[PDB]
């Protein structure tokens, strides 16, 4: 129990660090774009642009290097292609999950209802086969033992 909790805490810390680094990279890219749009052409601005480019390159290289470490937990978990198709549409990702979980629940309810129906079917059939055919009563119960 403690090992699973420790592994979950490690995976959460590593993904929080990854999230913070990528957020910093995004902020640096935003600053780079702002500087490019409002570039005055001064040598100091050029040096700042070079420094920002170098910092962005170093940050991107660090994001790759740690993620390839065999001791990292970041490798632990595929991505759904239907989610990759849906996610571009300008929104907050909840209706794909709502409607698909609704379909899942409908399938589960269908499964439970058909299981109950089949159970009553075979119960009634066993009862009547015992009734009109007592000589076959003994195997029928065994049939239940073979099924249940």
């Amino acid at each position: 129990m403690n090992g699973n909790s420790t592994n979950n805490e490690q995976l959460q810390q590593e993904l929080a660090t990854t999230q913070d680094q990528v957020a910093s990279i995004i902020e640096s890219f935003v600053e780079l774009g702002v500087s490019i749009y409002d570039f005055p052409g001064t040598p100091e601005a050029t040096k700042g642009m070079i420094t920002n480019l170098q910092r962005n390159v170093d940050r991107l290289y660090k994001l790759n290097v740690r993620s390839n470490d065999p001791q990292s937990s970041l490798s632990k978990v595929d991505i759904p292609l239907e989610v990759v198709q849906y996610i571009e549409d300008g929104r907050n990702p909840d209706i794909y999950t709502r409607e698909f979980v609704e379909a899942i629940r409908r399938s589960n309810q269908y499964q439970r209802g058909k299981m109950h129906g089949l159970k009553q079917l075979r119960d009634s059939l066993a009862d009547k086969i015992v009734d009109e055919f007592p000589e076959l009563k003994e195997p029928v119960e065994d049939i239940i033992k073979r099924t249940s």
């Binding site: 999230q19 990528v22 991107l60 993620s67 978990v77």
Partner: protein, 101 residues
């Protein structure tokens, strides 16, 4: 199976290749083109790369929230089309065996 580390690797390789191609194109582009157009193109490329890295950031945040709902979801889907395949197999068996009736 696909690892998040392999997504990080391939995306970073694609970003590096795109940046190298853009730098090369700027290198062999004639100087007659105004620097404003080149700056705009570089800004657009940086914006696209930032958008890709932000999609990866969403995959990092998703994996931080994540597998439980996805495991239940996949198991229930497997049960669903297994039931559907069983129904179709029953129908096919009856269609085939009606000849022997």
């Amino acid at each position: 199976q696909v690892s998040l580390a392999l997504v990080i690797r391939n995306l970073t390789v694609f970003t590096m290749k795109e940046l190298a191609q853009y730098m090369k194109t700027n290198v062999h582009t004639q100087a007659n083109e105004p620097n404003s157009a080149k700056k705009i193109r570089f800004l657009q490329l940086i914006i696209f790369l930032r958008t890709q890295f932000l999609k990866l950031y969403v995959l990092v945040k998703w994996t931080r929230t994540i597998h439980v709902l996805i495991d239940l979801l996949n198991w229930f889907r497997t049960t669903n089309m297994n039931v559907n395949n069983c129904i179709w197999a029953l129908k096919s068996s009856l269609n085939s065996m009606t000849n022997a009736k």
